[PDB]
Amino acid sequence: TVEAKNETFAPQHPDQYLSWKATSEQSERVDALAEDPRLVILWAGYPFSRDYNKPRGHAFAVTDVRETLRTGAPKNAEDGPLPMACWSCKSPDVARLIQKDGEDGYFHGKWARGGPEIVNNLGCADCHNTASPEFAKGKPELTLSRPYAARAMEAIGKPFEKAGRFDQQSMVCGQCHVEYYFDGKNKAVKFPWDDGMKVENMEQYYDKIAFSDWTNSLSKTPMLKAQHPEYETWTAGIHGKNNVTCIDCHMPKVQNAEGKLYTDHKIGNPFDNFAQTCANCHTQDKAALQKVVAERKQSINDLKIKVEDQLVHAHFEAKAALDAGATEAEMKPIQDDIRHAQWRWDLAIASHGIHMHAPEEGLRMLGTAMDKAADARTKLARLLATKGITHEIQIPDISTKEKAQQAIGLNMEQIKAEKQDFIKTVIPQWEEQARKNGLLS
Amino acid sequence: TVEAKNETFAPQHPDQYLSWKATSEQSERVDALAEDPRLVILWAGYPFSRDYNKPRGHAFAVTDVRETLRTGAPKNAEDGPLPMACWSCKSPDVARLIQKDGEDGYFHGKWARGGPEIVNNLGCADCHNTASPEFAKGKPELTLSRPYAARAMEAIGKPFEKAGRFDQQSMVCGQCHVEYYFDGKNKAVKFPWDDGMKVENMEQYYDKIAFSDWTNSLSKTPMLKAQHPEYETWTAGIHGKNNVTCIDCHMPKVQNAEGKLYTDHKIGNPFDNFAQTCANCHTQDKAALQKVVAERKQSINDLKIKVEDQLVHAHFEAKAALDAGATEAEMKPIQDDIRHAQWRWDLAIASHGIHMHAPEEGLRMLGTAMDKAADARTKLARLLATKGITHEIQIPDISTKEKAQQAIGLNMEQIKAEKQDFIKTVIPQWEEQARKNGLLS
Numbered sequence: 001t002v003e004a005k006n007e008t009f010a011p012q013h014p015d016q017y018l019s020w021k022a023t024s025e026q027s028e029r030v031d032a033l034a035e036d037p038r039l040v041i042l043w044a045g046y047p048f049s050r051d052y053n054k055p056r057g058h059a060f061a062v063t064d065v066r067e068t069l070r071t072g073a074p075k076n077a078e079d080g081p082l083p084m085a086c087w088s089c090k091s092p093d094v095a096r097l098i099q100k101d102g103e104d105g106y107f108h109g110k111w112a113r114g115g116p117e118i119v120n121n122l123g124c125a126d127c128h129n130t131a132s133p134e135f136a137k138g139k140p141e142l143t144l145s146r147p148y149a150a151r152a153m154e155a156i157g158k159p160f161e162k163a164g165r166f167d168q169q170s171m172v173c174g175q176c177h178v179e180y181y182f183d184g185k186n187k188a189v190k191f192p193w194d195d196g197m198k199v200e201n202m203e204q205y206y207d208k209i210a211f212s213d214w215t216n217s218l219s220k221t222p223m224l225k226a227q228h229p230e231y232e233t234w235t236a237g238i239h240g241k242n243n244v245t246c247i248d249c250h251m252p253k254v255q256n257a258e259g260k261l262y263t264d265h266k267i268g269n270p271f272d273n274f275a276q277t278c279a280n281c282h283t284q285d286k287a288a289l290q291k292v293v294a295e296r297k298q299s300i301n302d303l304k305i306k307v308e309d310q311l312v313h314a315h316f317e318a319k320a321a322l323d324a325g326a327t328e329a330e331m332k333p334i335q336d337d338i339r340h341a342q343w344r345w346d347l348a349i350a351s352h353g354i355h356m357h358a359p360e361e362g363l364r365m366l367g368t369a370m371d372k373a374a375d376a377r378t379k380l381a382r383l384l385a386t387k388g389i390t391h392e393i394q395i396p397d398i399s400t401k402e403k404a405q406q407a408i409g410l411n412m413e414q415i416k417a418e419k420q421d422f423i424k425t426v427i428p429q430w431e432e433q434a435r436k437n438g439l440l441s
Numbered sequence: 442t443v444e445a446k447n448e449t450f451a452p453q454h455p456d457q458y459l460s461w462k463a464t465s466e467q468s469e470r471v472d473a474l475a476e477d478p479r480l481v482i483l484w485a486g487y488p489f490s491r492d493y494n495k496p497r498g499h500a501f502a503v504t505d506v507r508e509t510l511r512t513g514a515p516k517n518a519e520d521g522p523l524p525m526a527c528w529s530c531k532s533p534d535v536a537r538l539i540q541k542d543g544e545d546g547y548f549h550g551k552w553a554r555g556g557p558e559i560v561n562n563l564g565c566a567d568c569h570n571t572a573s574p575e576f577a578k579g580k581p582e583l584t585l586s587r588p589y590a591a592r593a594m595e596a597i598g599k600p601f602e603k604a605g606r607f608d609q610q611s612m613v614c615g616q617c618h619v620e621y622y623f624d625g626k627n628k629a630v631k632f633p634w635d636d637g638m639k640v641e642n643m644e645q646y647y648d649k650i651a652f653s654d655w656t657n658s659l660s661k662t663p664m665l666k667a668q669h670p671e672y673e674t675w676t677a678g679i680h681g682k683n684n685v686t687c688i689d690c691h692m693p694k695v696q697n698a699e700g701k702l703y704t705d706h707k708i709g710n711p712f713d714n715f716a717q718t719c720a721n722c723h724t725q726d727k728a729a730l731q732k733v734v735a736e737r738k739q740s741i742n743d744l745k746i747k748v749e750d751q752l753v754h755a756h757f758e759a760k761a762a763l764d765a766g767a768t769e770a771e772m773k774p775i776q777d778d779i780r781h782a783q784w785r786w787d788l789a790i791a792s793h794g795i796h797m798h799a800p801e802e803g804l805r806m807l808g809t810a811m812d813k814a815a816d817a818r819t820k821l822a823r824l825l826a827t828k829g830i831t832h833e834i835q836i837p838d839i840s841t842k843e844k845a846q847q848a849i850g851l852n853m854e855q856i857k858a859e860k861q862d863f864i865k866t867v868i869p870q871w872e873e874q875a876r877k878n879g880l881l882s
């Protein structure tokens with residue numbers, strides 16, 4: 001009953017369809033590793049050290065998951081580094097497959113397998129019960145199309161079916177804009193919300209299940225990776241506490257040419273229509289509010305860099321200790337400190353909207369990160385001393401993404417060449433096959 | 442022209458006088474060192490390590506400056522640890538003496554010299570031009586009675602006489618509720634605002650003039666002491682950015698029995714009259730706003746303790762390094778880090794209102810503190826190593842105020858006994874002299 005072919009809905013819902021399509025205008029893709037090469041060091045051993053960009057329009061979700069170095073260059077349906085779960089927050093064909101094959105059936109196997117199947121842009125069936133007769137009437141009929149997100153909302157005491165309209169508005173966004181990890185042997189998406197959504201809760205959660213995303217290749221620390229915790233951090237901030245919904249800012253009610261009200265589906269920066277977003281609740285002018293938000297961004301950026309610098313030193317200092325013959329027992333307390341420091345930093349800044357949604361919480365989290373970084377480096381200086389090393393550990397030149405990637409042993413020329421081959425040759429075949437199978441226009 | 446005898450105004454301005462007097466109800470004097478023994482270590486070698494309480498009602502300003510161990514037990518007008526400047530933010534007799542003796546003359550002398558002269562409670566002439574014929578008519582005629590405060594407001598580009606009513610309201614409070622230091626041979630009160638009011642501005646200011654408040658007796662670090670930066674931090678926070686004045690929250694307009702409006706002079710906790718404070722601008726329930734403010738208090742407290750724990754270790758590790766033979770040159774970089782780390786911590790939490798006035802700014806400052814503390818301790822571990830020490834430096838038992846004070850070499854029994862003698866013997870003599878000379882009663 002899932003209709004992943006979004007254009008099916010264009011005749012009946014032109015205003016929503018046209019604005020939805022318009023996120024294709026949000027096309028600039030900012031390379032975050034180029035901007036901040038420290039990230040390559042922090043994520044050494046993990047695919048984020050190869051390729052990490054800031055988000056752009058929803059229209060690009062399928063493209064970007066296909067093009068990122070993180071998904072590699074699979075040669076067949078059982079090849080490639082990543083599992084099916086990488087599709088989960090990119091396309092309504094995910095809802096289609098979960099319905100068709102069941103949740104476990106969907107998650108089984110490799111990302112490559114989904115290539116000729118997950119082909120429609122993030123769209124109507126991701127957020128709407130389009131099968132309801134009320135939908136054609138122009139009623140939204142919001143729904144959670146993602147069972148793992150439904151379970152998560154229940155876990156935090158906010159079951160979707162019991163939630164009011166305004167709670168539901170943010171929850172649809174909360175199907176994807178969250179911290180997650182891959183759970184069990186099928187690598188199913190799970191939001192680590194069992195103990196609560198605060199950084200401390202999630203840290204306790206992951207430690208109790210002895211989970212790690214990867215081992216940092218420099219320090220051998222069993223690491224946790226944070227991802228875009230918008231739902232969690234929005235909940236923590238002033239707007240979320242007042243149930244100012246994601247939609248209030250990102251999907252304002254606007255008028256069509258005929259003066260009819262509809263929800264603007266061109267999901268982007270709220271400051272691009274300040275008059276219909278912030279101005280709904282605030283008397284301050286646009287420049288005044290922009291300056292405040294920019295101020296928080298700078299405050300957080302400055303502290304974020306300080307934490308990252310401390311962590312860069314910590315990873316290289318851990319490397320020096322290992323290279324000097326440090327044992328597993330000797331390294332363990334240091335690795336615990338690095339893991340916790342970096343977890344707190346990563347959850348703090350992994351959402352590019354933190355300085356807006358919950359600046360005070362971002363700053364708090366960074367402070368607690370810094371505490372554990374201090375511990376790591378102090379433990380390390382003593383351990384290194386016991387090996388006869390009493391000088392400051394020198395760091396290689398990591399002033400550029402290229403240098404940082406070189407330093408951690410990536411062959412970026414080759415990795416990029418192989419991906420480019422994959423993009424040019426495999427993607428068109430995937431699209432051709434989906435068309436032949438009637439999954440794609 | 443200054444009338445320091447507040448009761449003079451009782452018949453003319455009963456509603457203001459009676460509510461002003463009622464801060465005597467805010468009488469709990471909470472021992473901050475008892476609640477947080479870490480403070481004794483951080484302030485080791487400074488009077489705050491002896492006695493530091495949370496603020497109470499304005500009515501207690503004179504008694505509290507008299508009774509604190511910080512001002513000691515002077516035997517005569519030329520004795521005691523502190524200068525005349527400690528009276529400055531405590532009583533309208535200060536305004537009287539500045540007029541009578543000039544500002545320079547007022548500041549010249551030890552604190553003990555002012556004892557028989559500075560006897561009336563913080564009051565009308567501190568905030569009002571009581572000599573103005575308009576004041577007798579019920580007009581506030583707000584004034585800056587403190588020249589050093591007028592100069593500071595000028596230094597931040599806000600000359601009082603050009604400021605509007607709303608700006609002036611907070612400036613009156615900003616005569617005392619600020620970070621300050623003692624300047625020159627006369628030890629005049631000066632606000633370190635010449636380069637701006639941000640922690641970074643003040644830090645650079647104090648470093649440029651190579652100023653220090655004391656030398657920490659453990660680490661031998663040339664330290665800076667922060668004090669109650671409400672004006673600076675209020676300015677940084679969301680309320681200050683919107684010119685929500687100190688008065689809007691702490692001195693609301695209320696009605697008397699006859700239904701006539703007056704300004705409530707019982708300056709205390711805004712939540713005591715939520716209906717006429719926050720509820721004028723906010724639609725949220727009292728309990729909802731209390732819960733948010735309490736959450737920020739906890740967030741800041743948690744991080745505050747983490748920074749203090751790091752600084753406690755840093756001071757004792759510095760002590761260990763000095764004990765191991767570290768030279769002045771070897772210690773300098775470490776002491777630079779300790780100085781900066783502690784300055785940032787102290788300014789962050791020296792205001793008991795920070796979690797309300799500017800929580801994000803308090804949190805930010807603490808993060809920057811933690812950066813420099815990490816640096817201090819890492820440097821220390823390497824230095825200690827060069828002296829043949831590679832183990833963690835153990836800390837004495839500081840689980841209570843009494844233990845911490847013992848640990849840093851204070852004879853608290855002696856100090857308290859000497860102060861009790863002074864309080865019981867000298868204070869009545871001061872009051873008798875003041876009454877004799879028509880200053881009191």
Ligand code: HEC
Pocket residue numbers: 051052053054055056064065068070071082085086087088089175176177178180189228350351352
């Ligand atoms: C499996 C490990 C993957 C891979 C390879 C990708 N995703 Fe996601 N994704 C989600 C959201 C909300 C965003 C935008 C917000 C943000 O990025 O901060 C993204 C973005 C991306 C991109 C574009 C940015 C980039 O990293 O270069 C790419 C290439 C990408 N993803 C690949 C949401 C989710 C999930 C919600 C639970 C899940 C699961 C994933 N993504 C998984 C993956």
Ligand code: HEC
Pocket residue numbers: 006009010013016017020021122123124125126127128135138139140142165169172173247251261262263264265
């Ligand atoms: C989440 C990322 C969504 C996508 C993808 C689509 N829609 Fe949407 N829609 C969404 C929200 C949060 C809302 C507002 C609900 C509310 O409580 O106000 C809507 C609204 C609609 C409506 C109702 C009419 C209106 O308010 O404009 C319709 C008919 C609608 N949306 C249609 C629609 C179409 C055709 C989509 C694919 C092109 C589509 N939506 C995607 C959330 C999301």
Ligand code: HEC
Pocket residue numbers: 026054055056057058059060061062064065088089090091122126127169172173174175176177246247250251267268269
């Ligand atoms: C999973 C199906 C998602 C749902 C439901 C929502 N979002 Fe999303 N968003 C998602 C991805 C994978 C991306 C990145 C796309 C890319 O190719 O980079 C985004 C991006 C955004 C952005 C950034 C837009 C830009 O930079 O131009 C915003 C502001 C955003 N998303 C907000 C948002 C809102 C408010 C949602 C509920 C209505 C929502 N998203 C749902 C994935 C998914």
Ligand code: HEC
Pocket residue numbers: 054055056170173174177230231234235239240244245246247248249250269270271293294297351352353356357
């Ligand atoms: C106003 C009170 C908002 C609410 C509620 C939500 N968002 Fe937001 N978000 C808002 C602004 C003004 C900005 C940009 C800040 C800037 O410096 O310009 C953002 C940012 C995001 C992003 C980052 C997008 C990017 O291009 O980097 C995302 C992914 C995002 N917002 C999503 C999001 C979600 C999922 C929300 C509900 C949980 C949500 N936002 C609420 C304004 C507001």
Ligand code: HEC
Pocket residue numbers: 237238239242244245248249270271277278279280281282289290292293356357358359679723724725
């Ligand atoms: C109502 C639906 C709102 C919209 C749209 C925006 N804001 Fe908001 N804001 C709102 C409330 C109810 C509050 C709490 C204060 C109160 O009135 O009780 C706020 C608060 C802020 C703040 C201060 C808190 C913070 O998180 O820093 C800022 C800086 C702020 N709002 C900015 C802002 C911006 C930039 C918006 C458009 C992107 C915006 N708000 C929309 C209510 C609502």
Ligand code: HEC
Pocket residue numbers: 492493494495496497505506509511512523526527528529530616617618619620621630669791792793
């Ligand atoms: C204005 C620039 C001041 C100067 C100069 C001094 N003090 Fe002060 N004091 C001031 C304020 C605004 C407050 C309340 C806010 C707070 O956080 O404390 C105080 C409080 C006191 C107290 C009561 C609390 C305590 O510390 O136990 C005492 C005993 C006190 N002040 C003493 C004191 C001394 C000895 C001074 C000279 C070094 C001194 N004060 C100067 C404002 C100002």
Ligand code: HEC
Pocket residue numbers: 447450451454457458461563564565566567568569576579580581583606610613614688692702703704705706
């Ligand atoms: C600062 C700590 C003050 C003290 C001490 C005293 N007053 Fe006050 N007063 C203060 C302010 C900030 C205001 C409000 C001014 C405004 O802009 O609204 C006032 C107000 C008055 C007034 C005006 C009438 C009114 O609003 O109630 C009068 C007549 C007055 N105050 C008298 C007064 C008396 C008699 C005092 C000593 C007992 C006194 N004030 C102390 C600031 C401060």
Ligand code: HEC
Pocket residue numbers: 467495496497498499500501502503505506529530531532563567568613614615616617618687688691692708709710
């Ligand atoms: C110096 C002459 C001051 C002026 C002018 C203002 N304040 Fe004050 N305040 C001052 C001191 C020395 C103290 C501590 C008194 C003690 O003995 O502990 C205070 C205290 C406060 C408090 C705390 C009250 C309590 O805890 O019960 C508050 C909330 C406060 N002050 C606010 C305040 C306001 C709003 C002012 C402008 C109208 C103001 N103060 C002026 C010193 C001085």
Ligand code: HEC
Pocket residue numbers: 495496611614615618671672675676680681685686687688689690691710711712734735738792793794797798
């Ligand atoms: C509302 C927007 C306020 C503004 C403007 C000012 N203050 Fe405030 N302050 C407010 C509250 C609700 C509280 C108590 C917080 C709590 O946890 O209950 C405070 C606290 C203070 C304190 C500390 C008092 C204490 O007893 O520890 C002081 C000294 C203080 N406030 C003074 C002060 C000054 C000088 C202001 C203008 C520069 C100011 N406040 C503004 C609420 C609000």
Ligand code: HEC
Pocket residue numbers: 238282283284678679680683685686689690711712718719720721722723730731733734797798799800
């Ligand atoms: C009008 C003169 C106000 C009074 C009285 C109080 N607040 Fe306020 N608040 C006001 C504004 C203009 C804003 C900015 C948001 C906006 O609407 O533009 C706020 C914001 C807050 C916030 C969020 C920001 C923050 O500093 O954390 C909180 C938590 C808040 N206000 C609480 C609060 C309390 C507890 C008050 C009484 C002691 C209070 N406000 C009074 C305006 C005004």
Ligand SMILES: [Ca+2]
Pocket residue numbers: 054055056057
């Ligand atoms: Ca973007």
Ligand SMILES: [Ca+2]
Pocket residue numbers: 179180181224225226227
């Ligand atoms: Ca994760």
Ligand SMILES: [Ca+2]
Pocket residue numbers: 495496497498
């Ligand atoms: Ca108090």
Ligand SMILES: [Ca+2]
Pocket residue numbers: 620621622665666667668
């Ligand atoms: Ca000071």
